[PDB]
């Protein structure tokens, strides 16, 4: 097959960054009461 498949954008690594930013911030509901 086309070997370009091994040099595509990894959905899994983009996911990681997203998860490192908001893994599940919906339960957090973190507020800064300044």
């Amino acid at each position: 097959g086309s070997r370009a498949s091994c040099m595509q954008m990894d959905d899994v690594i983009d996911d990681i960054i997203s998860l490192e930013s908001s893994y599940n911030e919906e339960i957090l509901g973190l507020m800064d009461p300044a």
Partner: protein
Amino acid sequence: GSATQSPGDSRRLSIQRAIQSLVHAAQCRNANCSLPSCQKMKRVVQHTKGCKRKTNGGCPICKQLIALAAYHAKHCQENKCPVPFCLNIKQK
């Protein structure tokens, strides 16, 4: 103050703590178990048992298991694993 966004530093350890709960509660068959989180986290693992609400985005808990197990499975190459959603990751 501190941070307007959620840093990967804090979420990392946050997950890991939760994962301790998840990995234990997932396989824990000890009824006498009376630790801090396993008991509660048990009902969380037990929540996913009959979850169909997750596919409609109504599971913040399954969102967590997904969240943590994906991270946990980042270092998993086993087909069998304690937590529920780790094997879900492997289904892809």
